[PDB]
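Case study.
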Amino acid sequence: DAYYHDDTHEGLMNEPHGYLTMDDPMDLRPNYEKSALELLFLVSGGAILALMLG
Amino acid sequence: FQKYPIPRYLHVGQWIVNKNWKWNTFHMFFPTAILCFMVWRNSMISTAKPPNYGEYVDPQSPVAPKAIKY
Amino acid sequence: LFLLFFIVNLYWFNSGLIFFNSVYKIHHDAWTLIFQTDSILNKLKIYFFLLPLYISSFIHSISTWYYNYILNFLLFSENLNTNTNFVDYITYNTLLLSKFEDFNLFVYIKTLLITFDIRQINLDFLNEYPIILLTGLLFLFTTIFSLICLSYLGLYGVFILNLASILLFWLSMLYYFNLIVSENYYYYISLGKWMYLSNGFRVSFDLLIDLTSISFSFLTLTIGVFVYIYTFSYFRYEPLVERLILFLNSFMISMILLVSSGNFIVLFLGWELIGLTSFFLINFWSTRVGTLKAAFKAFSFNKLSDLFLFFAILIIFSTTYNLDILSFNNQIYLYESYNIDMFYWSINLIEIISFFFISCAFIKSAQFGAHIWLPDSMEAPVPASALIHSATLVSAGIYLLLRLSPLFELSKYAYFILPLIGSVTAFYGGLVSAFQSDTKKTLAYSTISHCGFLMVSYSTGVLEFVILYLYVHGFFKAATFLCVGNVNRFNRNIQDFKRMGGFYKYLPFECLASFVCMINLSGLPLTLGFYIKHLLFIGLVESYTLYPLIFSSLILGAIAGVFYSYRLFYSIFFDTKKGKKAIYLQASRIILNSKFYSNTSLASNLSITFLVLISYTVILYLYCTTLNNYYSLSDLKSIYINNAYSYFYKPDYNFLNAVSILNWFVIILLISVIYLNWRWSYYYTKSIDSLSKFILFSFFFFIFSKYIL
Amino acid sequence: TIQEMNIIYLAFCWGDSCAILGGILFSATHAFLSALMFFLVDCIYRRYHTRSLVEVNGILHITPNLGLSILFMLVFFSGIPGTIKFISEFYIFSGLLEASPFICFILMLVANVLGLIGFSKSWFNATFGMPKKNTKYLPMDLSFKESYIILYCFFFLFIFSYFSSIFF
Amino acid sequence: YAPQKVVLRNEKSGYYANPDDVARRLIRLISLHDKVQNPSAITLKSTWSEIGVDPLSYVEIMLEAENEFYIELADEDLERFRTVEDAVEFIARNFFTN
Amino acid sequence: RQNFAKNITTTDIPKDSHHFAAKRSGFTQTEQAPFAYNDVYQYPKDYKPWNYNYKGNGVLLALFLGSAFSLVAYERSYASKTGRYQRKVQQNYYQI
Amino acid sequence: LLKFDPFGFYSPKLLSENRPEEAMPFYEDYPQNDSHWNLWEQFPEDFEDSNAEREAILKSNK
Amino acid sequence: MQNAYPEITDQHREFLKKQGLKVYEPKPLPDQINPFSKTYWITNAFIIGVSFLARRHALKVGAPRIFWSGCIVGVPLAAIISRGKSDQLDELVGARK
Amino acid sequence: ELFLNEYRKRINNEVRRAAILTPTSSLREKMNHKIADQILDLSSPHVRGAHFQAVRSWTDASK
Amino acid sequence: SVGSLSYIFYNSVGGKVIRDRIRASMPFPKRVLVQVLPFVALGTALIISRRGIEGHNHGYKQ
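After joint prediction, the assembly is written out as follows.
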C-alpha cells in the first residue's frame, strides 16, 4: 500500500501476549483444584482406554 | 483501521504476529498430516467402490446383495 | 572405533546368517553341525563364528522373556515361566539357531528402506482408495488447530498453514472430480460406527463422494480457495484477519461435510454446522449489536430449517428404519402408495416428507418469503458474503433436491411448488437487484433470483441443467463479489454506488474483471449464463396450471440481469464522479506514482484472474460432458427421464421462434439501457444521431449479410 | 431445565416400553447440560457481579474463554448430532412421531425453534456487544478450574455417544 | 512490535488532522462563497457575521465543508460553532477528518 | 479472605530487588517515609504467559502407555474370545 | 485496561503487592483467583523445625 | 441368506467372459492399508520415532508439541480401531464374511 | 424384536450394497426381483423399528 | 487413593513458575517418584479392573 509500516517498526503490532488463564503464575497457594480436575480428566481417559476401547 | 494499543494481560488475537511462526507452522502442519494419514488408513479399511469399467457383478457371487432366508 | 567395530560385526553376522541359511534349508545340516557333539574344539567352533548369531540370539532370549513378564504383569496370563528356571530357557533359546532361518540382515534393511518409497505409489491405488479424504481431514484439522493455536501461529503462520491445507485439498479434489464426473467413479467411505439412535441401531459417520457430492464440493472448494487467497488482501490491516480466515475455513469444511453426507445424520450435522458457521461469519463484527440482529435472523431461519429437516428425517426413519441416503433413494418408491394419519388428515407419505424437505430447502436456498435473511446477511465481510451467496449456504437446498431426487419425482407437492416458487423467486430477486444501489445487496438479490432459477431448473426434470446453472452462477457470482469487495474497500466501506464513479482509472483490473464476470453472470447473449438460461427455458414444462404466472415471472427475471449488471458496472466505474473528494484526491497524488502503485492487491488481482480462468475451464468441461452430442456424464441416479434433451438436440421451429422472442426482448433492453439519456448532456443530440445511424447500419448489415453476399 | 425435564418425563408415560432408554439418556444429557449452563451463569455472576442481560454484555471481548464457552454451550444445547442431546431427541421424537405425529411436530416446533430462539437471543446478546462501562472493574479470563469443568462437560456430552448400545 | 511492557494511550497533540491545514482548507472553502467579499479579512478569531456569512450561507458553507473533509457535522455542533477557530478545532479533533 | 502463608519453605520466591530502590538520603521535611520492601517478582526468561509452559513428558508417556495397554489387552481379549491363545492372522484382509 | 497487570509479567509486581497508604493497614491484595481449594502449608520433607531459640535459651538458663 | 438376484447361466457367464468382461471380486487391502502387515507396523514405528524427534525439536524452538504427542498417542489408538473394525463380523458393501 | 430390527437393518444394508455394485440402469429390476418384497415384509407393523412399543397380542409375542 | 493423593500433593505446591522451580530443585529419584508414583498406582488399578472384566483364564483354547 501507499505508506506501510513493517512489523519490526510498528509500535502497535503485538507479539503474542496475555495470560492464558486467571491463575497467577507466581501463586504461592497449595491450590489443588486444577490438579484434581486434571486427575479427573486423566483417570476418565484411562478408564475409557483400559476398560472400554476394545 | 488505525492500530490502537491492546492490553498486555488480555489473551486476544488482535494484531498478533509471532516472530517464530515458521517453525510453528511446520510443527502444526506435519503432525496434523500424520494424524490425518492414520485416520485415512482407518477409514480406507471401510471403503466401498463400484466395479470398474468392463467389470460386472456375478449375481451368484457372495459379493452380490443377498436376501434374508426366513 | 565404534563405527568400524559395528561394520565388522554386521559383516560377520551377515556372513554367519548366509552360512546358516544356505546350510539349513535342505534339512541335512539343519541340526547336525549346529549343536554338534561337544568336542570342545567343535564347541568353540560353533560358539566363536556363529557368536554374532548366538549373542544376538541371547538378546532375543532375554528381550522376549522380560517382554512376556510384562504381559504377565499387565494381563495375568501364562503363569509366567514356572516350568523353566531361567537357566534352561536361556540355554535352550540361545543355542537354538532355528530362529535365524531364511533371514538375512541386509535383506531386512532393504525391506525397511523400500517401505517408504514414493515412486511406487501408482495411480490405481489413488483410483481405488480416495486420497481426497486425507486432504479433507488435513484441511479440517488444520483449521481446528489454528483456531485453538491462534497465538503459536501469527497472521502469517495461520495464513500459510491454512493455505497449504486448502491447496492440498483442492489439488486432491481436482483429480477425483475428473474421475467422478467423467469415468463414473464414486466412493462410500465409512468412518467407523458413530452413535446409537434406536434400540440395537447404530448409525455410522459415512460419506458419499459421488457426482452430486463432487460437484457441490468442488465448486465450494474452488470458490473457497480463491476467496481465501483474496481474503488476506481484503482484510489487510484489520485486527482479526486470522479470525476471518478461520471462520471462512470452518464454513467451507462444514459445507464440504454437508454435501458429502452418506447418511441423513451426517446431512443434519452438516446442515447445523453450515448454519452456525454462517451465523459466526455474519456476526463477525461482534462488537456491533446491529450485526447481531441480522446474524440472529439468519440463525432463526437456520433453526427453522433444522426443525424441518429433523422432522423429515424422523418420518423417514419411522417409515424405513434406515438413514443411509443410497438405500433410502433406491427404496422410497416402495412407499409411494402410503399415507400417514396426522391428526384429522391422511397425508400421503411422499407428500409430507417432500413438503418438509422442500420447506427446509426453500429457507436455506433463499426463496420468496424465506429470502428476507439473505439481504440482511450482507453485514458479513465480502469474502464471507462471496462464499455464502455464490455457493454453499444458498446451494444447500439445491443439494437437498438433487441428493433426494427419487423422492421429489413422486411428489405432487414438489411438482406444484418447485416451478411456481422458483419462478416467483427468480422474478422478485432479479427485479429487486435491478433497482438496488448497494453492490452487496444487488448481488444478494441476484443470488436470490438465480436460486429461484435453480429451483425452476430442477422442476424441469433435467439435473444436468441444474448442475450447469449452479456451477456457472457460483463461479461468476463469487468473482463479482470479490470485485465489488475491492471496490467497496477502495470506497472506504461505502457500498452504495451513488457515492462512486470514475473508478475505472483507480481500479482498472477491477473494472475489466467485473465487466467479464457481469457479462457472464447476467446471462447476456453469447455467454455461459446465456447458455444456462437457454437450457432452463428448453426444459420448462408447460403442463402447470399456473404456467402463465410461472412463465411471465421467468421471462421478467431472465431479462432483469441486463439491468443490474449494467447499472452496477457503469455506476461504479464509468459514471460521473459522485464520490467524495477525499477518495479520489488522496489516491492520485504525484508522489504515489510508482511501479508499485495499486489501489488493490497484486494477490487479489491474481486470485480473481485465476478464479475466472478456472471457472471458464470447469464450465467448458461440464458443457462438453453434458451438452455435447456424445453424452459423457456419469450416472445421476435418477430414473425419471423426460424429452427435454430433444429440444436441445433436434428443436422445432416454434421453440426457436420463442427463444428468438426472448433474445429480441433482451436486445431491446440493451438498446434502452445504452441509449436512454436520463440527464442533460452535451452529447444528447449526438447520442440520438448515433442511435439512428446504428439502426440504419444494422438494417443494411442484415440486408447485405443475408441477400447480397 | 423445566423444558428438558418435561421432555424426559414424557418418555416415561408409556410404561416399560422402549421409551425409557431415551428417558435415561436425556436424563444424563440434561444433567450435564444444566450443570454446564448453571456453571456458566456462576462464572458470569462471579466476574461481572450480575446475571441480567441489561447489565452485562460483550463478554467475548473482555473474557474470551467465557464467551467461547457460552457459544459452544449454545451449540451443544441446539442438539448438534455429535453429542448425546441429539440422540435423546431422536429417541423420544421418533417414538412420539409414531405415537402422535402432529403432537410430535408441535413439541419439536415449540421446543427446538421458539424456545431455542429465545434461549439463543438471551445468550447471544450477552456474548456480543461492547463492555464499555466500568472498565476499571472489568474481570479477567476463565481460571483453570472453570475451564476444565466446562471442558469435562463438553467431553462427556461428546464421548457418551460412544457408550455401549446394549443398554441404550 | 509491542515493547512487551505496558504502554498507555498516547494523546499526542490532540489533533487527528493538521490544524493549520484544516484551517487553510476551511478558509479557502469559505472564500469560494459569493457573499464573502474579502478572503484576506478571514481569521480564525473572526466571526461568521464579521466575515459576512448569514445563517443560510453558513449552512451551505458547512455542508460543503462536510463534503470536503469527509465527515458529517451534527446540527447541534454546527450551531455550537461561534468562530472559524471553533470550527477548525472541531474538525481537526474529529477522528474521521480526511 | 485468603489466609495462607506467603512465606513458603519448599522454595525461594524468584525476586528482583534492584527494580525499585528505596530512598535513603536527601529527604525533605514534607516527604513521606520510604518503603521497606521493594522486591518484585522475576519471571523466567523463557516463560510464555499465553500458553501451557508444560515441558515434561509425563502426560504423553502416561497416555501412550495406556493406549499400548489397551492395544495388548484388546489383542488378548480377541484371542480369548476366538478360543485361541494368540490371534490367527489371515493371509488376506478385505474391506468391510 | 492497558495498565492492568495483576501477575507482574509485563508490569513488575511487588512481593508486598501494594504500597500501603499512610492511613490504611498493610492488608494484602485480593487475588484474581479467590479459590479456597488450598491444602495446609506444605513444607519440604525432612524439614528441621525444632524450636532452636527456646532450646538455646533453656540451655543457657540450665 | 439367499442370492436376492435373478440367476444367470454358466453359458451366459462364459459368453460374457468371451466378450472381454471380467467378474467383479473384492481385492485384498494393501500392506499399507492392512493393519496386520509389517509395512503398516514399520510405518507406525517410523511415525513414533519422527514424532519423538520432532517433539524434541519443538521443545527446543518453542513450537507446539501437542500435535506430535497426539500422533504418538494415536498410533496405537488407530491400530486398535482398525483391528476392531476388521474383526467385527458386520459387513457393509465389502467382501462377504 | 431386536432380531426383526436386525432383519430390516440387514435388508437396508443389502440395498445399499446394490446401490453401489449395480448401476441405476438395471438396479430396480434386480431389486424388485426379491429384495422389495422382503423390504415390504419387514415394515412398520411387522417390526418395531424406532417405535416405542411393538403392539403385539399375546399370540404374536408367543410366535 | 495413593495415586490421587500423590498427584495432587506433588502438583499443587504453587503456581506454574513456583512448581517449575520446586520440581527443578529436586534430586532425580524425587522427580522420578513425582512422575512415576501417580501413574503406576492408577494404571495398576485399571489393569486389575481389566483382568476382572476379562476371561483369559478359560481353558477351552487351542
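Observations recorded in class. The longest helix of chain A spans residues 33-52. The helical segments of chain A are 33-52. We will return to this complex in the next lecture.
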